[PDB]
Amino acid sequence: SVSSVPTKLEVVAATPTSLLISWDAPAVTVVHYVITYGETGGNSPVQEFTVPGSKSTATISGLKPGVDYTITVYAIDFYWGSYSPISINYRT
């Protein structure tokens, strides 16, 4: 509850149908980041993909224009499993 990995998740650029997200990586090595996204209304299904731990950005594409979305990212430690997630909202 007090911490999350990654931190400071943000949308740095966008098109009508895509988002470029960025985050701060921790010092410790991360296996990969789990990125989920879906319509904030809670009715549409959540889509999920992974991004290698060496990356600090990712592109979310195939989005609908003018829709509220919730994006969630959490890292994975090789030995100790997942970290707590961090979530943001963005309207395309």
Binding site: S1, P26, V28, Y79, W80
Partner: protein, 256 residues
């Protein structure tokens, strides 16, 4: 289940090699526990992170009154946390420094507690537990608590003094290593120092491999008998833990 937000972090109980150990209270019930911190960057620099990950799983399954309970573990960006049972009386090492040596009633009771714990471990096919005094904690009733994770404990090394001959020569070993360790510990409890102590590694190695040791005059015949039965060079000649628990010197002096 258990997470960092569930605990209020109290005063430090002591510092380990990779971080501090704190008295802790579960927020909802105020139940007293110990929170052990191990920095990830330190674990990796020492090359023991994999070892810690494996051993927290191992220890989480060991439920015995004389084995410190490991209730769970979690992590954040920089630390690994262990939620451990709180042993309020500290290490038996500090008790031994205070008393110089233990009498036979106190020693035989300790040996009974450890023989019980080691028999439980052996029933789980887990062997070679760390029972050096510096790594044994004491419960509220003064009962011993095996901790293991000895590499994580801040202190020369005491490991060598407790290794049986098959381990110092790096040969295949079995559950009989714990019988040898028991004999080394019984001697140190009664005498105040381990039996094979020497000022160099080669000298200590020679003493262990030859089982060269002497008893001070005050060590009684029953204690000598038990210790000598345990300190056999040939592991198969060391007794069963049941024979220790039923040894006449143990049953005459143990309060358990």
């Amino acid at each position: 289940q258990w997470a960092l937000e569930d605990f209020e972090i109290g005063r430090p109980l002591g510092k380990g090699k990779f971080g501090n150990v704190y008295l802790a209270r579960e927020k909802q019930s105020k139940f007293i526990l110990a929170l052990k911190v191990l920095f990830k960057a330190q674990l990796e620099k020492a090359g023991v992170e994999h070892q810690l990950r494996r051993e927290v799983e191992i220890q989480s399954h060991l439920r015995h009154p004389n084995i410190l309970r490991l209730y769970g573990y979690f992590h954040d960006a920089t630390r690994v946390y262990l939620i451990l049972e709180y042993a309020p009386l500290g290490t038996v090492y500090r008790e031994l420094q205070k008393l110089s040596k233990f009498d036979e009633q106190r020693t035989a009771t300790y040996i009974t507690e450890l023989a019980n714990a080691l028999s439980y471990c052996h029933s789980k096919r887990v062997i070679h537990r760390d029972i050096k005094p510096e790594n044994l904690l004491l419960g509220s009733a003064g009962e011993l608590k095996i901790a293991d994770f000895g590499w994580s404990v801040h202190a020369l090394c005491g490991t060598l003094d407790y290794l049986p001959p098959e381990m110092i020569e790096g040969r295949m070993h079995d559950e009989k290593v714990d019988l040898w360790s028991l004999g080394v510990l019984c001697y140190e409890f009664l005498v105040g120092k381990p039996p094979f102590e020497a000022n160099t590694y080669q000298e200590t190695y020679k003493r262990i491999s030859r089982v060269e040791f002497t008893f001070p005059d005050f060590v009684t015949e029953g204690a000598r008998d038990l210790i000598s039965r345990l300190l056999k060079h040939n592991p198969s000649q060391r007794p069963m833990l049941r024979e220790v628990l039923e040894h006449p010197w143990i049953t005459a002096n143990s309060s358990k």
